[PDB]
């Protein structure tokens, strides 16, 4: 593979093999009182500051230098320009990758097959703005003349996670907006329990599906329509309660949706990078189009930082480089994202898709199989919840787990004169401090002696109280989680993911890995009907199907 | 470490090194027509069947035999009896481990320090029963005489996760019960956004905290009381709207709660194993005490299965052993739990604590440091949501990830004549089939040719469409997700965790790993107050705090 053959990578790996057991956070900080200044970035977006402190990582100036050299050697900057210039960097599908055009507030032309994409982008945005205005003003009414109180987004993967995570994160800005609901699972309980809490007369459904033939999404949509029509009866009423986010005008018309209410996007918009397009309609409806533009503007700001900042001080790039260090040198399988913010409770889940579906690849640009690790397993839970759930393993377990700790300085709810956020902040800081410092046998011993522990009891319990520490973390702190700031943060990670993919020489923008499961599922569907034994698959699949048919009747 | 020195373990490790490149699922099945029958267990709980199919695992008759020999060699059965008999197996804290006592429906005496624990267990259950009766019936009234419409649970970690996951999973059984709310994050937006939607006249708060001094929990509790008294004014009104799940009678009195409304539990009840105790009060209030008893009954049935079943056919034991195989021989860092059920959307999250906080240890019983891996990183998202988010990596990524696929045969919402559930089931089945089978280059080439792909396009696309497969999974299918069945499934994993811990020779029931973080946070708290620069910590902690103080005043 390209990466393994890179001289800069080889240089990095040789340094690692020689000075690995030399890297100790406690000692690094004790020897360099200016470590924080040397390994941290402070970004002023003019709408809040972003501090990216990567000083608690197992790195030195030499390591960072070699890492930056690896990025240059792998052509990170050239690839970046190709992305922004509209070139088909999604080589397996032969398409451009332009989620950056979706939020290109400067409106500088971006060509695709010699044609500027911006006019179309702004056309859809204008349509979104108009629609959001009417629904929020109460001008758009249901079939019985009532205003919309609830908006239901139906989609899977990228047509679901992004909008859901953002509306959850910007909940405080939804004043004067309709309630939003997200239905994604084909599991019938999802649409069912959602519909049970809604009134057909004041509900607006958003069907998100490029092709408008997506099995899960369309099945849910048809279930929603049957439910609606059961109340409305009149088919022409569907046009007042259903809109589509796609490009299939024919199927959209067939469903009963008014064509002028079809918000399209393009093939250069990846699902896991689509919240910035028409897919984000529910976002705009919930918090208003103005806040939606703020969201886009934050991303655009981060897009520029990524493009004009030298690699050595480039946030997305350094975040990606640090991950390559832990993944390809320390051999860490996972990456934890721990935001200390309840509104961001689905941030980690969102990037679980953005990162994993982008970089969970094994075939390089030249068709060669990688001979090294690629995308890591991303996971996490928001601050203090995760801390009281699985931190025991991060502190005293056996796995090395790079962790990103995020938090806004200003809270959306400064209740009790800021008492809650104070404690939240203190824990945010204490956890990375502990993770790095740990507690030695001697330090633990002193504590146990002070507790008046028996000489014998002290020696028995002592080892259990030792924290080996030396566990690396990133601390990302931003002024306040506003729509603009959230846009900047999401874009930052999108570009981190982009850099790592280029370094690994994989295609972060295709997803051929989903085809097999879909193919095999279609074959099993017709076999589930009936009580006849199934024997067309392997013994397990067969046995599972027959157990299912047996228990179908079981009364419990 | 005991494990490494174990003869049986060494035998397994040796076999692994010799036959690893010989383990291939396609061949294994093609070579054994009875593979499903040989590697699957069907349990009849009398309230539904459970099929634990572990045939899609990289294992053979010999491996399973060696694994069971490992379980015997490591003394799994003796350790189990010690737990059930009330001995102090939580050796670092000198305590018994008796969550099995909590659901001991048979009421068989279980002694701790010479006293049967059951009478007290049942005393609390009866109090819970009476309270739920009165609250749900409407007999229990607020300070203005209204009936309780909302129940708010306030607790962290083990006093939140269990009840939340269970009430979410059993939502269908909550008809006639009040709505339940879970507040756990010290982050003020949690209690703030929750209180903004409640009426002080019909809201009942449950303060879950053993010591009743837990910082996060008591802070949220005091904030809720302040909000409550704001409207009620009369401090004696608190007794009609706040109850406690603890043993500190004094602190509960001071708060303003009626002592007769303090539901207690004991030190042999681990937080991450407490939903079966008074901690589960919110569960009982939401779905009724009858359903709570079924839940307990389900777990009780599984406890018996675990205690009376020979190892070779013991579900918890087998699951535990398969994990030891992937973790200590294959070197897998994670374990994915993927239930194809939206109601179980918080199932993986629950065991993320149950498993990780239990086995994320590194000091053995002899006080010696482990020289092998222990607890894995548990993660996941429910069925089809996760499938459309990160399966790309599971199918074509670079890391090996053991996965547990779970699903109920009968759905709680058989809408559209079971159409949704049919598709859900087809995907549950097809995914494990695909993970195992994969798609060869030859098969992929034929598809591309049949699709009429160009010779140029074919060669370029070909390698990207190959699925290496041979990825192991467990498929756990159960008749229906009823209160009883859920109890059984949760208990099954609790015991799997117990078995793994004994084999690793660690303590699955303590959690010393949380102290350092809490100590360092207490020290930072006062330092955040005021405008002075902090210089008392390492440079990073100092820098982060000074950035916070600076941005604290920023207007954005």
A540 touches B at CB < 8 Å: yes
- Token pair for residue B320? 């535990």
Report the C-alpha gap between B380 and B334 in whole angstroms.
Answer: 10
For B352, the closest of A36, A187, A390 (CB atoms) is: A390
DSSP state letter for A146: P
Domain-ending residue, one of A293, A321, A337: A293
For B545, the closest of A340, A429, A436 (CB atoms) is: A429
Report the C-alpha gap between A487 and B339 in whole angstroms.
Answer: 32
Residue of A424, A478, A416 lying closest to B187 (CA atoms): A424
Taking phi over 0 as left and psi of -120 to 50 as alpha, with beta for the rest, B331 belongs to: left
Indicate if B83 and B180 belong to the same structural domain: no
- Token pair for residue A299? 């991303």
Instruction: Outline where DSSP puts E strands in B212-351.
Output: 242-245, 334-339
- Token pair for residue B243? 């109850």
Indicate if A24 and A165 belong to the same structural domain: no
Number of folded domains that form chain B: 3
Report the C-alpha gap between A263 and A477 in whole angstroms.
Answer: 35
CATH number assigned to the domain comprising residue A531: 1.10.1390.10
- Token pair for residue B111? 């002694």
Contact yes or no for A411 and B32 at CB 8 A:
no
CA distances for B389 relative to A184, A359, A509, B343, B407, angstroms: 11, 12, 14, 18, 19
Helix (H) or strand (E) holding A285: helix A281-287
Instruction: Outline where DSSP puts E strands in B436-527.
Output: 473-480
For A411, the closest of B188, B378, B409 (CB atoms) is: B188
B38 touches A at CB < 8 Å: no
DSSP letters spanning A354-391: HHHHHH---B-TTSPBPSS--S-EEE---TTTGGGTTH
* A527 marked as binding residue: no
Residue B90 bridge partners (DSSP) = B95
A209 touches B at CB < 8 Å: no
Report the C-alpha gap between A418 and B529 in whole angstroms.
Answer: 10
B412-416 contact pairs (CB < 8 A, 24+): B412/A189, B412/B172, B412/B343, B412/B480, B412/B481, B413/A188, B413/A189, B413/A192, B413/A193, B414/A188, B415/A188, B415/A191, B415/A192, B415/A223, B416/A188, B416/A223, B416/A226
Which of B25, B210, B429 best probes binding to A when mutated, by most A CB atoms within 10 angstroms?
A: B429
Contact yes or no for A540 and B48 at CB 8 A:
no
Indicate if B284 and B237 belong to the same structural domain: yes
Which pairing describes strands B473-480 and B403-410: parallel, antiparallel, or unpaired?
parallel
Contact yes or no for A541 and B433 at CB 8 A:
yes
Residue of B405, B400, B410 lying closest to B386 (CA atoms): B405
Indicate if B360 and B221 belong to the same structural domain: no
Q: Three-state SS for B90?
A: strand
The alpha-helical segments, DSSP class H, found in A25-179 are 25-31, 35-38, 61-73, 76-84, 99-102, 118-137, 161-169
* B189 marked as binding residue: no
Residue of A437, A341, A429 lying closest to A380 (CA atoms): A341
For A426, the closest of B378, B420, B528 (CB atoms) is: B528
Indicate if B279 and B257 belong to the same structural domain: yes
A414 touches B at CB < 8 Å: yes
Give the per-residue SS3 of A209-231. CCCCCCHHHHHHHHHHHHHHHHH
CB neighbour class for A325 (10 Å; exposed up to 12, middle 13-18, buried from 19): buried
Q: Are A498 and A355 in contact (CB under 8 A)?
A: no
Q: Are B400 and B334 in contact (CB under 8 A)?
A: no
CA distances for A7 relative to A14, B105, B511, angstroms: 10, 66, 45
DSSP state letter for B151: E
Q: Are A225 and A255 in contact (CB under 8 A)?
A: yes
Contact yes or no for A398 and B193 at CB 8 A:
no
Range of the domain at A542: 515-555
Provide the chain B residues 468-487 that lie in CB contact (below 8 A) with chain A: 468, 475, 477, 479-480, 482, 485
Indicate if A499 and A534 belong to the same structural domain: no
B451 touches A at CB < 8 Å: no
φ, ψ (nearest 5 deg) of residue B372: -155, 180
Q: Are B524 and A428 in contact (CB under 8 A)?
A: no
Indicate if B86 and B110 belong to the same structural domain: no
B31 touches A at CB < 8 Å: no
Report the C-alpha gap between B481 and B490 in whole angstroms.
Answer: 12
φ, ψ (nearest 5 deg) of residue A15: -65, -45
Contact yes or no for B554 and A422 at CB 8 A:
no
Q: Three-state SS for A178?
A: coil
Annotated active-site residue B333? The verdict is: no
Indicate if A121 and A133 belong to the same structural domain: yes
Taking phi over 0 as left and psi of -120 to 50 as alpha, with beta for the rest, A438 belongs to: left
Report the C-alpha gap between B36 and B55 in whole angstroms.
Answer: 6
Q: Of these residues, B33, B233, B388, B417, which one is catalytic?
A: B388
Q: Which residues of A are part of the catalytic machinery?
A: 357, 388, 518
R_g (Cα) of chain B, nearest Å: 26
Q: Are A510 and A92 in contact (CB under 8 A)?
A: yes
Annotated active-site residue B225? The verdict is: no
Resolution rounded to one decimal, in angstroms: 2.1
Which of A3, A49, A50, A517 best probes binding to B when mutated, by most B CB atoms within 10 angstroms?
A: A517
Indicate if B387 and B452 belong to the same structural domain: yes
Indicate if A273 and A356 belong to the same structural domain: no
For A551, the closest of B193, B434, B479 (CB atoms) is: B479
B417 touches A at CB < 8 Å: no
Helix (H) or strand (E) holding A249: helix A249-255
Q: Are A406 and A341 in contact (CB under 8 A)?
A: yes
A458 touches B at CB < 8 Å: no
CB neighbour class for B286 (10 Å; exposed up to 12, middle 13-18, buried from 19): buried
Q: Give B245's contacts (C-beta < 8 A, 6+ positions apart).
A: B155, B159, B206, B207, B208, B209, B262, B263, B264, B265, B278, B279, B281
CATH number assigned to the domain comprising residue B427: 3.40.50.10490
Q: Are A355 and A327 in contact (CB under 8 A)?
A: no
CA distances for A278 relative to A271, A353, A354, B512, B527, angstroms: 11, 19, 18, 49, 46
Helix (H) or strand (E) holding A204: strand A203-208
Instruction: Count CB-CB contacts under 10 A for residue B310.
Output: 9
DSSP letters spanning B355-396: HHHHH---B-TTSPBPSS--S-EEE---TTTGGGTTHHHHHH
B179 touches A at CB < 8 Å: no
Q: Which residues of chain B neighbour A54 with C-beta distances below 8 Å?
A: none
Q: Which residues of chain A neighbour B554 with C-beta distances below 8 Å?
A: 48-49, 409-410, 479-480
B455 touches A at CB < 8 Å: no
Q: Give A398's contacts (C-beta < 8 A, 6+ positions apart).
A: B360, B362, B370, B372, B373, B374, B375
Query: For chain A, what is the largest distance between any 2 Cα atoms, rounded to a whole number of angstroms?
Result: 83
Instruction: Look at the alpha carbons of A419, A420, A426, A429 in this order and tell me if their dihedral is positive or negative.
Output: negative
Q: Are A199 and A181 in contact (CB under 8 A)?
A: no
Residue in this structure with the two tokens 């060494």, named with its chain if needed: B10
Provide the chain A residues 270-329 that lie in CB contact (below 8 A) with chain B: none
Nearest chain B alpha carbon to A375: B397
Contact yes or no for A524 and B426 at CB 8 A:
yes
Q: Which residues of chain A neighbour B184 with C-beta distances below 8 Å?
A: 384-385, 388
Query: For chain B, what is the largest distance between any 2 Cα atoms, rounded to a whole number of angstroms?
Result: 83
Domain-ending residue, one of B264, B293, B322: B293
Indicate if A91 and A169 belong to the same structural domain: no
Q: Are A163 and A275 in contact (CB under 8 A)?
A: yes
Report the C-alpha gap between A259 and B424 in whole angstroms.
Answer: 31
φ, ψ (nearest 5 deg) of residue B280: -85, 10
CB neighbour class for A341 (10 Å; exposed up to 12, middle 13-18, buried from 19): buried
Report the C-alpha gap between B344 and B372 in whole angstroms.
Answer: 32
Instruction: Count CB-CB contacts under 10 A for residue A543.
Output: 23
- Token pair for residue A378? 């991303």
Residue in this structure with the two tokens 């991950």, named with its chain if needed: A323
Q: Are B287 and B19 in contact (CB under 8 A)?
A: no
Q: Three-state SS for B467?
A: strand
Contact yes or no for A548 and B185 at CB 8 A:
no
CA distances for A227 relative to A221, A232, A242, B422, angstroms: 10, 9, 12, 19
Domain-ending residue, one of B229, B259, B293: B293
Report the C-alpha gap between B533 and A342 in whole angstroms.
Answer: 28
Indicate if B92 and B68 belong to the same structural domain: yes
Give the burial string for B439-468 (b: 16+ CB within 10 Å, else e): beeeebbeebeeeebeeeebebbbbbbbbe
* B469 marked as binding residue: no
Give the burial string for B52-80 (b: 16+ CB within 10 Å, else e): bbbbbbbbbeebbebbbbbbebbebbebb
Q: Three-state SS for B350?
A: helix
Instruction: Count CB-CB contacts under 10 A for residue A199.
Output: 12
Report the C-alpha gap between B5 and A368 in whole angstroms.
Answer: 41
* A167 marked as binding residue: no
Contact yes or no for B223 and A437 at CB 8 A:
no
For A383, the closest of B187, B342, B369 (CB atoms) is: B187
């Amino acid at each position: 593979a390209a990466l393994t053959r890179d001289p800069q990578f080889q240089k990095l790996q040789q340094w690692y093999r020689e000075h690995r057991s030399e890297l100790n956070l406690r000692r690094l900080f004790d020897a360099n009182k200016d470590r924080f200044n040397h390994f941290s970035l402070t970004l002023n977006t003019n709408h809040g500051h972003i501090l990216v402190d990567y000083s608690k990582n197992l790195v030195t100036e030499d390591v960072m230098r070699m890492l930056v050299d690896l990025a240059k050697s792998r052509g990170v900057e050239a690839a970046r320009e190709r992305m922004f210039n509209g070139e088909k960097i999604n080589y397996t599908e032969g398409r451009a990758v332009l989620h950056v055009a979706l939020r290109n507030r400067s409106n500088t032309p971006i060509l695709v097959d010699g044609k500027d994409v911006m006019p179309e982008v702004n056309k859809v945005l204008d349509k979104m703005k108009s629609f959001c205005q009417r629904v929020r003003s109460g001008d758009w009414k249901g079939y019985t003349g009532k205003t919309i109180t609830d908006v239901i987004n139906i989609g899977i993967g990228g047509s679901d996670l992004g909008p859901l995570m953002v509306t959850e994160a910007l909940k405080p800005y939804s004043s004067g907006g309709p309630r939003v609901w997200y239905v994604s699972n084909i599991d019938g309980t999802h649409i069912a329990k959602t519909l049970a809490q809604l009134n057909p007369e004041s509900s607006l459904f958003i069907i998100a599906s490029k092709t408008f033939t997506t099995q899960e999404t369309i099945t849910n949509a048809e279930t929603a329509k049957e439910w609606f029509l059961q109340a409305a009866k009149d088919p022409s009423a569907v046009a007042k309660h259903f809109v589509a986010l796609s490009t299939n005008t024919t199927k959209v018309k067939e469903f009963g949706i008014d064509p002028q209410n079809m918000f399209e996007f393009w093939d250069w918009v990846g699902g896991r990078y689509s919240l910035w397009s028409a897919i984000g309609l529910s976002i705009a409806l919930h918090v208003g189009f103005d806040n939606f533009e703020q969201l886009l503007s934050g991303a655009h700001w981060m897009d520029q930082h990524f493009r004009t900042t030298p690699l050595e001080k480039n946030a997305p790039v350094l975040l990606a480089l640090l991950g390559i260090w832990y993944i390809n040198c320390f051999g860490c399988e996972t990456h934890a994202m721990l935001p200390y913010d309840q509104y961001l409770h689905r941030f980690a889940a969102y990037f679980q898709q953005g990162d994993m579906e982008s970089n969970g690849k094994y075939i390089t640009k030249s068709g060669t199989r990688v001979d090294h690790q690629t995308g890591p397993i991303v996971w996490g839970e928001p601050g203090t919840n995760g801390q009281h759930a699985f931190y025991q393993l991060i502190h005293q377990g056996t796995e090395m787990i790079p962790c990103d700790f995020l938090i806004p300085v200003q809270t959306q709810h400064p209740i009790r004169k800021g008492l809650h956020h104070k404690i939240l902040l203190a824990n945010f800081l204490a956890q990375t401090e502990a993770l790095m410092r740990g507690k030695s046998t001697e330090e633990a011993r002193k504590e146990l002696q002070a507790a008046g522990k028996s000489p014998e009891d002290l020696e028995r319990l002592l080892p259990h109280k030792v924290f080996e520490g030396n566990r690396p973390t990133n601390s990302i702190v931003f002024t306040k989680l506003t729509p603009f700031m959230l846009g900047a943060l999401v874009a930052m990670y999108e570009h981190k993911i982009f850099v790592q993919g280029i370094i690994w020489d994989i295609n972060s923008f295709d997803q051929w890995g989903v085809e097999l499961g879909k193919q095999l599922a279609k074959k099993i569907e017709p076999e589930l009907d009936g009580s006849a034994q199934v024997t067309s698959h392997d013994a397990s699949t067969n046995g599972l199907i027959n157990f299912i048919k047996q228990q179908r009747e079981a009364r419990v």
